[model samples]
Target: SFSMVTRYAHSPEDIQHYDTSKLRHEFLMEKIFNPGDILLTYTYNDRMIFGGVMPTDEPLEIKLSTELGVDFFLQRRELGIINIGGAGAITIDGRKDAMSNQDGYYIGMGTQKVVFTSEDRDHPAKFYVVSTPAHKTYPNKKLPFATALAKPMGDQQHLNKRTIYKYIDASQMDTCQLQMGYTVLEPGSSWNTMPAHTHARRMETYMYFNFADPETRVFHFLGKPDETRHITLFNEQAVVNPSWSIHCGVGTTNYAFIWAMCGENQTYDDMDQVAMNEL
Candidate 1:
């Protein structure tokens, strides 16, 4: 029902020499969603954090911390959440988002007050969160997927066509140093982030969701272009790719994912574009 996760702190040398198996074991999560429970995986990369919080009737509040070395959970951080299940409402510092499915709320730093509760316990809401260390508190904003800025990228011929919804982007809002968004691939489109690129200034994490078939899997590509590697990912699983590595995937079926990152730049287009020939 519960598992303790250690935050990773790896140096460049350690990452360079890591073998295929070792890379996946440490940076990738294979099976994350546990019905009637919550699962968290904290990474030391860019201090970018994320996890799945599935609540069924019972309200779930983040456990207090010394591991975080803070009095409360949001003491030194900001959090962005996207609910992908039944109706739910999140109370933050006495404020409420009154979230429904696909609704997201961005809670800024120093907002120690926060709580999650489901509207219909039978079909509990699954909230995916991405948090980063913050130096200032931005106003808490609720963004509905339908209302998010939609950017249609890739092409039908490329088979990577999808719409990206930018939630916590610099062009849209303010946060100390975080950029989070969701990208949904069309039903017939299974490739996500092809024509792969890597941002040397920031570290990114990708969480696969909306998995409808049990037999479907995504082959996630990583590592430097010439010396690349791949990982097979299941539903609800997540992976952390370092700044120096490219992140892309092709699924056996349709799916969606949340992309979150932090570090030197917030420009989503600030990537070192890589070509197929480079691979």
Candidate 2:
């Protein structure tokens, strides 16, 4: 079971006057993981597609023929997947590989078939997937969380300390326009990417998860640097950040999030810093 929802791009001026409900309706993906289904969002922001694939008793596959105008889903697109739920295995063109929590796979373009199955039906695997337009085909590779490059950022004083795990990056792997990673906040810290910046060359998405408390809320900051606005998000919710908007957030309790970007260039240091006076 698979379906795609369409979301068009918006100008900075268009989003500036949008209220909370309007903002959420346009950018917030409230639901991604559903039982026995593959839910995807096809956004015009850099022509990226992302969502969740949850398999239960039966294996699941992605088939976006008409939506993408291709013979197969990955005909001209590359994919990056991270399993955030139970253990599972993904089969690409008849080859199978196991994926545990935080484990990921980067599937290059031209793959014939991609299937996802869970180890246990009661506790199905929730595969978070992101796909970008590709003009090249690289070898399919598996990315283990334990082996990912870890970069520690922030400090206790700022309450924004966190560990960033880079899974699929240009420095490590070859990808067309996709770069994905995971960030885990320390128990005492609740903020991620403070003194936020924006990259005019790329669009990004932040998927928040792993909340210990149901009452926890993540106040995600967006909009322009000087004219900032916030959106209240719960666990497992994702927000799309256009190239012109600043992306940052502070949660009530510690949590983890997956960040994926795709656009003009793959340079990680191409961010334009937002001055404190401007923010």
Candidate 3:
């Protein structure tokens, strides 16, 4: 029911020598899909986000208690959700939006009310979410993957080609303090965020999805530039990364991930780029 904080996880010396098993224990969430409940992990690093929400009942609302150390769940935060399972509906405040597979929603701050419901219980809806603190309210919007702006990067030859689907980005939406996006890797490509960089001002989290094999895995990397290590992540897993470390991965098969980041600044590109030699 709970996981402790690894606030002092890896020292530069330890990180450079970590093994796969230890790395997976620290960074990956292997089994998170629940039939009738929501599973979440709250990391202190950058106040980042990660969650596995499945609705098999009538409706589900994210409820917060003292563990969150806040008044209401959205009292000081904003959220972005992407539906990766069956069709559903998400209602924020009083406005409702129908959600299909690969569809996402940007929920503004001060929206103390939000609920998720599926059209059929047999075909439960699975929603992956990223959340961050907000100082003000921003207008909510629905983003379709096909029509949204795309940031294409990576090389097909290296088998790392991927296109970033910019959903809750600064240019498209406005939020007090969060930038989010989804990256879909090509069929033959499995790696992402190569030539890794770190944003000292922000922390990031990744939720992997669209996988058909339960045994397929992803090697997720993190740590200081010259002292990096990786975690073995399974399908539907999530990981929280600190701001001081770079976030990247190479999956056994093509996959899609939802990246949510937050911190002192909202500048998504303001990262300290790491050289290949450094990685």
Candidate 4:
């Protein structure tokens, strides 16, 4: 079973006037992983789709129509997936691949059929998927997190020290325009992307998970650097970041998150960094 909720585009001016509940309703996405279901958010920002795929008692597949004017979902799109749960298998066009915890896969355009299955029903795989329109089809491959490129940033003093794993990027492999990865913060480090930046070329979605405490919440900041606001995110919750908005967050405790980008290009350095004095 698959379900999706649509989020239309919003202007920065309209967002600034939105209250807490209004902002949450428009940007924050909850209930990502559910039993044997695919829950997705189709955001009009850059036409990117991000969501969860959990296979429990039976296998699950993605299907769509009238959404992209295409027969199949990936007919003119590419997908990046990362498994954050137990062992599972993703069968793309009948070719199956085993996926472990933190394992990622890049599925190119024109992929006809994709079925997700879990090895154990009790521990169904939590597949975080982000898909975007693609002009061309690229080769598909599995990207293991153990072999992913890790960039350590910040410091413990700033409470922002963390390792960013580049799972699906042009630098590592290649995609039409989508890039996905995860960041892990060490204990006591809660701030992420300090002196935050915004890339006019792309929009992003962040899914916060692995909370140290059940009640732990991550305050995700967005909007222009000079004028910012935050929304509280719980475990397995996600937030949509507009292209013109700055995306960064601080958790109540150290946590991890999966970040996915899709828009004009794959250039990671195309960011306008904010100064400390601006915030």
Which numbered prediction scores highest in lDDT against the true structure?
2
Candidate 2: stretches off by over 4 Å = none
**Order of candidate numbers by lDDT, starting with the best:** 2, 4, 1, 3
Displacement of residue 94 (Cα, Å) in model 1 is 1.9
Residues 54-139, model 1: lDDT tens digits: 77757777665697899988899889898888888888878776888889888898888788888887887888888788877789
TM-score per candidate = 0.92, 0.98, 0.89, 0.97
Better of 3 and 4 by lDDT: 4
Whole-model lDDT for model 4 versus the true structure?
A: 0.90
- lDDT value, residue 63 of candidate 4: 84
* Alpha-carbon deviation at 154 in model 4, angstroms: 2.4
Which candidate leads in TM-score? 2
For every model in order, what is the number of clashing pairs? 0, 0, 0, 0
Instruction: Quote the lDDT for 112 in model 1.
Output: 81
Give me candidate 2's TM-score against the actual structure.
0.98
Give one digit per residue, the lDDT tens place, for model 2 in 139-177: 999998788789979889999988999988998899999
| lDDT, candidate 3, 1-279, per-residue tens | 323233344445665667777677666667666777777766667565567677876688778746578877887888888888898888888778888877888887788888888878989778887777788888888887567778778788888788888877777767777777888888889888876889888778888888646667888887887777777776788877877788888888888888887888888679988878654
Query: How does each model score on lDDT?
Result: 0.81, 0.91, 0.77, 0.90
- Residue 35 lDDT (model 3): 72
Error of 4 at 48 (Å): 0.4
In angstroms, what RMSD does candidate 3 have relative to the true structure? 2.6
